[PDB]
């Protein structure tokens, strides 16, 4: 049963561990803002929690912090008592509703499991108000605490008291949700909960080293003045897009020639949009090596080179840097450090006839290999025997070119496939080629 | 036999070969401080040597380290004709002296030496002063000869010392000795030792030093100089332990970069000898602290990260750097304060068939904040209908593998990388124990 009230000037803790006296200091850290709403109960964690109560019969005796609150996340647990305060961080498989039977942990959690940490110390607890500040930062879990006398009152006392550090655990686990844990059978109790935010305070240390007053730096203009004096008294416009690089020409050419005679096209002095590439059919092979396909429009180069041809279905894997094969070193060789993309798709429906399609040839015999980015066109008898071929065929005299064959009744791996490779390069010249830009 | 006397105003030599006139100049160099005791006989950093005999009985000088034939020894011989300078490791006797003329009593025999020099001899009621000083492989001899009246001790006056010779010898010198040429006899000489000081020299109009004042003799002289005119305890903690750096290294199992292991180290003595003891690291660079001084500092808490990277991408790990793993797999803060170690592993993490066993992420919606880790395997959405199914068309799947074969060259072989990050200016530090 929630409620609201006023936080007044409470919840200031020693930020660090350096002694000071009779000096006004300015600190930037998480704090509870002055005069803020603190929910009064009878829960998200955010960046930290200020928790304050007054029930002096130990009805409040601990807390459970965790992320998902199940075995799926180790749940930090603090339990108070009269003998010894206990802190555990074991991966408790969390139950639906936590409570101690008074004292089996089973209702809290199913089974004790792996925990590299465990801690026990003097009891935290000692008409009296107890205030705690919990926060975990940079893989450390810090608890500050303080207690004070008070007259019977239904809201936070007017006045001032600083909070001294209590524990500083090196745990380093994520927490996003916490839950209190009372000591009842039904009943009810009371406590106050508030949330910290980053702020800039001005703290005043008296002669004995204890904080005795502090002023906020964002509450109201008077406080801003007190802090300053250090005393207590999208639009984007760009040219219209006209010059589009033509990619629908290097595509659906309907004449990709042979692999041994592959057309090379140079593209420059235009805006190149790669979106239209994905407007065609799903591609059998779509591989980019030196460039992530997402960022092609973001990074631009000097000139582009496109090479298109038709190869067999099972020979697609051979078209890559570092590959070896009949198509790899005799018809088209690629550099090891090739930067660009490769596209390949089936064209059996367009490059096959029942009688037989033999207009797609390829080199079969060659004296040596081919350097990367090279073509060979000459057709001479490949001499194999010791005797000269003398420009004629026969024994150990075979032609270097062999004709591929495609028919619609063939199975996968042999059907004709169209392959287009895009290559990109840089040199000492203006790029003059970049992608579309809004 | 020995005796003592006061140096008085003596031992001032032209610091440089620069002409000046009627200008008071401040110099900082090696001199013989005023009013000091110089030993009278009947090396350190320089020698003031002085004598007054007329019969030419005094001659020659021996400089060396061992006074034996195992190290080079400067030898300056003088006779009525010439002066001879040699650097030969002679076998000197206990009391060398010129026979007058065989040198067998001076030394046994000649041996290895380079510099042989001949010139007009230095020597020519008369007092002779010399200053010998050795610095940066250079041996400088300054001299002066004065007509001294019938006086027992050093006269009260001023006499500058001109340069005489400057030799590029370069021999480690620790001691020297003087020879005599004799029938018994007796002779004496004064020896004093130089120190670094600051002087204020006064040149007259003719270019010759006439007077000078010491800047650290008495407060009056300090005033003259400044006016430029003539009118351990260590309390480290008790705990002794060993930081398990051996466990971080040689673990035989390193995580892939997109899920990099994290190990926290505290409450132990940090000894870094084992690091260099491990291997000839290809890269070993420390940013916020010098690599040599890790053995005498104290830190709050240290973190060790370990993974494997393709060699050419090792430079990708540095504050304020860009690259696929820089922004997508492992981000280092701009204010990094630690060390990075990277060494080849091509012999252990490669296979002829292809040791993949290692992944890296290249598709990610947003840049990585420093010291983040991302472990999701969700299929990257390219900006279209949600491909929860598969990459398919525009959508893609991340985490390609690596391929390591012994055949790959440097720049594709695997390198094991370990990054140590430090914590400074915090709660009372714990990882420091190399000192008592």
């Amino acid at each position, epitope marked *: 049963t929630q409620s609201y009230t006023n936080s007044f000037t409470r919840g200031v803790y020693y930020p660090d561990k350096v002694f000071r006296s009779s000096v006004l200091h300015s600190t930037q850290d998480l704090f509870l803002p002055f005069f803020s709403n603190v929910t009064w109960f009878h829960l998200p964690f955010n960046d930290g929690v200020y928790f304050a109560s007054t029930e002096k019969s130990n009805i409040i005796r601990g807390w459970i912090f965790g992320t998902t609150l199940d075995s799926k*996340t180790q749940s930090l647990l603090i339990v108070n008592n009269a003998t010894n305060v206990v802190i555990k961080v074991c991966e408790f498989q969390f139950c639906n509703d936590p409570f101690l039977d008074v004292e089996s942990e089973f209702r809290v959690y199913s089974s004790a499991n792996n925990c590299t940490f465990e801690y026990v110390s003097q009891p935290f607890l000692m008409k009296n108000l107890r205030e705690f500040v919990f926060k975990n930062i940079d893989g450390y879990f810090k608890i500050y605490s303080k207690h004070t006398p008070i007259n019977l009152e239904r809201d936070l006392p007017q006045g001032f008291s600083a909070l001294e550090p209590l524990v500083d655990l090196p745990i380093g686990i994520n927490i996003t949700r916490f839950q209190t844990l009372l000591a009842l059978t039904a009943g009810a109790a009371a406590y106050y909960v508030g949330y910290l935010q980053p702020r800039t305070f001005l703290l005043k240390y008296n002669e004995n080293g204890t904080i005795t007053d502090a002023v906020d730096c964002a509450l109201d203009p008077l406080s801003e003045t007190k802090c300053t004096l250090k005393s207590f008294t999208s639009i984007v416009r760009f040219p219209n897009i006209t010059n589009l690089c033509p990619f629908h020409e290097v595509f659906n050419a309907t004449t990709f020639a042979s692999v041994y005679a592959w057309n090379r096209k140079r593209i420059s002095n235009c805006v190149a949009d790669y979106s239209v590439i994905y407007n065609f059919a799903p591609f059998f092979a779509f591989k980019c090596y030196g460039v992530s396909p997402t960022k092609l429009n973001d990074l631009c180069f000097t000139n582009v080179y496109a090479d298109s041809f038709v190869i067999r279905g099972n020979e697609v894997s051979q078209i890559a840097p570092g590959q070896t094969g009949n198509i790899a070193d005799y018809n088209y060789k690629l550099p090891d450090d090739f930067t660009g993309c490769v596209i390949a798709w089936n064209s059996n429906k367009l490059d096959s006839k029942p009688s037989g399609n033999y207009n797609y040839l390829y080199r079969l015999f060659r004296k040596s290999k081919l350097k990367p980015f090279e073509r060979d066109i000459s057709t001479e008898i490949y001499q194999a025997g010791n005797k000269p071929c003398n420009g004629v065929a026969g024994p150990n005299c075979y032609s270097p070119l062999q004709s591929y064959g495609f028919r619609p009744t063939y199975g996968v791996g042999h059907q004709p496939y169209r392959v287009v490779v895009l290559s990109f390069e840089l040199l000492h010249a203006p790029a003059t080629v970049c992608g579309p830009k809004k | 036999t020995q005796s003592y006397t006061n140096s008085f105003t003596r031992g001032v030599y032209y610091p440089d070969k620069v002409f000046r006139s009627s200008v008071l100049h401040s110099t900082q160099d090696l001199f013989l401080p005023f009013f000091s005791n110089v030993t009278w006989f009947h090396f350190n950093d320089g020698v003031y040597f002085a004598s007054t005999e007329k019969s030419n009985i005094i001659r020659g000088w021996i400089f060396g380290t061992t006074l034996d034939s195992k190290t080079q020894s400067l030898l300056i011989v003088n006779n009525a004709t010439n002066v001879v300078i040699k650097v030969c490791e002679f076998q000197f006797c206990n009391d060398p002296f010129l026979d007058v003329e065989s040198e067998f009593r001076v030394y046994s025999s000649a041996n290895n030496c380079t510099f042989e020099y001949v010139s007009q001899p230095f020597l020519m009621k008369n007092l002779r002063e010399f200053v010998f000083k050795n610095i940066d492989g250079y041996f400088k001899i300054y001299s002066k000869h004065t007509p001294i009246n019938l006086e027992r001790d050093l006269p009260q006056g001023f006499s500058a010392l001109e340069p005489l010779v400057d030799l590029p010898i370069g021999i480690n010198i620790t001691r020297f000795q003087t020879l005599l040429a004799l029938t018994a006899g007796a002779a004496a000489y004064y020896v004093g030792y130089l120190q670094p000081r600051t002087f204020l020299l006064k040149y007259n109009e003719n270019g010759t030093i006439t007077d000078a004042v010491d800047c650290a003799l008495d407060p009056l002289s300090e005033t003259k100089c400044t006016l430029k005119s003539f009118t351990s305890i260590v309390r480290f903690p008790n705990i002794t332990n060993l930081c398990p750096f051996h466990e971080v290294f040689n673990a035989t199992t390193f995580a892939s970069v997109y*899920a990099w292991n994290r190990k926290r180290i505290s409450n132990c003595v940090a000894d870094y000898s084992v690091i260099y003891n491990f291997a000839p690291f290809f890269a070993f660079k420390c940013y916020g602290v010098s690599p040599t001084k890790l053995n005498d500092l104290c830190f709050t808490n240290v973190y060790a990260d370990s993974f494997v990277i393709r060699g050419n991408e090792v430079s990708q790990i540095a504050p304020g750097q860009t690259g696929n793993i820089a922004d997508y797999n492992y981000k280092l803060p701009d204010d990094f304060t630690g060390c990075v170690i990277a060494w080849n592993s091509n012999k252990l993490d490669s296979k002829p068939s292809g040791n993949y*066993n290692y992944l890296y992420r290249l598709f990610r919606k947003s840049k990585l904040k420093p010291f983040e880790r991302d*472990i999701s*395997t*969700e299929i990257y959405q390219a900006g279209n209908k949600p491909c929860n199914g*598969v*990459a398919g068309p525009n959508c893609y799947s991340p985490l390609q593998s690596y391929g390591f074969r012994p055949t790959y060259g440097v720049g594709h072989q695997p390198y094991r990388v370990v990054v140590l990050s430090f914590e400074l200016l915090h709660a009372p530090a714990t990882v420091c124990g190399p000192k008592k």
Partner: nanobody
Amino acid sequence: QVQLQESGGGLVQAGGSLRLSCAASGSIFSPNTMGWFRQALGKQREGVAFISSIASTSYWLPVKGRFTITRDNTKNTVHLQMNSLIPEDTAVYYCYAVDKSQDYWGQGTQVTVSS
């Protein structure tokens, strides 16, 4: 130290069915993510399928219907149900446990289909 047990592989004719299973024992911290990778004979290694700890599944191949991933929360194990086997899936399989600190790997299982 983490041990991954794999079971369920072997020889099956075309169109068959089987059930691969990997169980992770040891440290295997709570917010883990498990998966299966495929290794064809003398080829690269591809990721068959991945299941998270929040039951979210990511199949890295257009293959749904063929594999199905089931999760056993009580023992923290993963089962891959194999149906309608076709010969191009004849490859060895490993399971992949990413955990939170340092991922792991299995030993290997032979899955074969032919006719």
